[PDB]
Design a protein around this ligand. Structure first.
Ligand SMILES: Nc1ncnc2c1ncn2[C@@H]1O[C@H](COP(=O)(O)O)[C@@H](O)[C@H]1O
Ligand SMILES: Nc1ncnc2c1ncn2[C@@H]1O[C@H](COP(=O)(O)O)[C@@H](O)[C@H]1O
Lengths: 323, 323
């Protein structure tokens, strides 16, 4: 009965996401692939969900869920194809679940994948109050010969940054600690939006721009900047014996990160190892294609810029250097 | 560090499940398919997990997780290909998580799918004590022309039952209520095993036998008996205007169900609408193939029998009739 109200309630959102490969959860492979390989992953949104629960605002958290999954697929060159979610809760609140699922559908549309199935589970005793937990699962497709595996990254490659929408879905344990110690007023305005708005802003989805970029340029590696922040994730594009030399003149941290550091008495050292600091993706490619790639990304709605280059590194040194 | 102990700890279990299609989470389609269609699903284990947590016994619950997912795929004719899990907890207990994941690997091997990825998430504040929640996701493959869609079911078809291992992963809310009201001693012996053992017995996986059966016989429909028990799930094989006429002489409920009914003061009416009552799958096929199908299922390690037939039904009547 509750799950019946919900099923009817979301069928619109689900149908919105349908792509022609979907049959009748059945899905054909897109016809363009000659040697398709499936690329899959699962993710949750983490402590960001705790903030959404604190704020009782559930309409965008599904976008973060889809984003986490799909932005990890694009790093290998995969085109998202379909998506499923598992939603667990103590007592099913149909409005809440419908809001979450609708935001999942919003994300799926921006990622170009169909929401084809899912599960809503009641686990009384496991979740307190109005809490729920949601897991996402995505399957994408890549042409076998075109997998981006990082083998092509060279010393001398340029590094492009693609701008983030805010903290995305990482660092939210520190966010919540900052908010609780400072007893922060989430209604405070900063640059025309409330602090709560800035912090719940959904993760940017990089599929439309990413797929176009990969099609038009020689992309050597991509890193999706997630747990461990800017500092930990940049090295995923680096061969052994190299470093990312970051041009510190090339961007300013988005103001929400500056606010978090000030409000929270946080070191820059910790900030860089927790938050994306404005960088959602970093891309390695030849220097002579970097400006064209940047223009393409911008044309597809991203913020993008040349943030650095890959240099030879000695045995001792840090793999990320800001200068 | 905790997630590092765990990753090393499970890599053996994961490698055990590898199939040749896995590359390097990357997976090719099996070569035999001419027009492959992907079939996918997500599931959790439900309140059975609460029993495993009550009993602090985590080594088989992953089998139930895989079983729930894969036994739903086989109903459409799909061959499980790969599997991913999302494990969420308040504080990561590496031994617990490793036990769960190893049991997932056990299930994957029996289902013939590779465990190719997953996520372990810490959500402090969301889960109390040692609680965790685990979601499963599976992708299988079916030849487009060979999808089992139920269109072939006929009045006059035989119905075969495939025996369950116990309650599988459904009815465990009622199980726990029975145990709590009766203050049942889970160490009590029944037919050579403890009550706790009977109730945690992992769900039977029907892939090896199922795939062979579909290959060798004209299977019209299959229903995996899950939520709502024997009574609610049998009608999934039925066209409009038909009923399942069940031969009540053809089996005896496994003793654990009789124990649950007696201990719990439960009506037969409720039992049939909650538990599988010994039937894990029901299969519709031509009568002239039923005996051969039964022998095949038995040769592949199942318990199986002809449990009834599909008859014409009048407007008013129940779709399941035991006589
Ligand atoms: N949270 C969800 N997201 C997407 N689809 C769902 C969700 N919950 C249920 N469904 C779909 O609705 C139908 C009934 O769901 P269930 O029997 O609970 O898995 C199935 O086809 C599901 O795939
Ligand atoms: N519960 C799990 N089951 C299977 N694989 C996992 C699990 N947790 C982590 N992994 C794998 O271990 C690596 C590190 O995990 P993570 O970065 O937490 O997703 C990834 O390749 C995961 O796919």
């Amino acid at each position: 009965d509750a799950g019946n109200a919900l099923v009817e309630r979301i069928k619109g959102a689900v149908k919105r996401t349908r792509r022609p490969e979907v049959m009748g959860a059945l899905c054909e492979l897109p016809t363009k692939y000659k040697h398709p390989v499936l690329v899959s992953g699962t993710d949750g949104v983490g402590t960001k969900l705790r903030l959404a629960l604190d704020m009782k605002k559930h309409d965008t958290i599904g976008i973060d869920l889809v984003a986490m999954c799909v932005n990890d697929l694009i790093v290998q060159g995969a085109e998202p194809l379909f998506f499923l979610d598992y939603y667990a809760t103590g007592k099913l609140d149909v409005d809440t679940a419908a809001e979450v699922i609708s935001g999942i559908a919003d994300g799926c549309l921006q990622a170009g994948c169909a929401l084809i199935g899912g599960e809503t589970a009641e686990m009384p005793g496991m979740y307190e109050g109005e809490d729920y937990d949601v897991a996402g699962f995505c399957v994408g497709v890549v042409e076998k010969e075109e997998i981006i595996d990082g083998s092509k990254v060279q010393v001398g490659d340029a590094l492009i940054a693609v701008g983030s929408s805010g903290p995305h879905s990482n660092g939210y344990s520190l966010v919540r600690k900052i908010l609780e110690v400072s007893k922060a007023d989430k209604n405070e305005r900063l640059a025309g939006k409330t602090i709560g708005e800035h912090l719940l802003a959904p993760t940017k989805i990089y599929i439309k721009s990413g797929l176009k970029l990969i099609a038009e340029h020689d992309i050597h590696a991509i890193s999706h900047i997630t747990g461990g922040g800017f500092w930990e994730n940049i090295p995923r594009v680096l061969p052994e014996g190299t470093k990312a030399v970051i041009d510190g003149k090339s961007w300013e941290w988005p103001v929400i990160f500056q606010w978090l550091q000030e409000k929270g008495n946080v070191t820059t050292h910790e900030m860089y190892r927790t938050f994306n600091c404005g960088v959602g993706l970093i891309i390695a490619l030849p220097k002579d294609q970097a400006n064209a790639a940047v223009a393409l990304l911008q044309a597809e709605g991203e913020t993008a810029w040349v943030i650095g280059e890959i240099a030879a590194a000695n045995s001792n040194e840090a793999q990320v250097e800001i200068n």
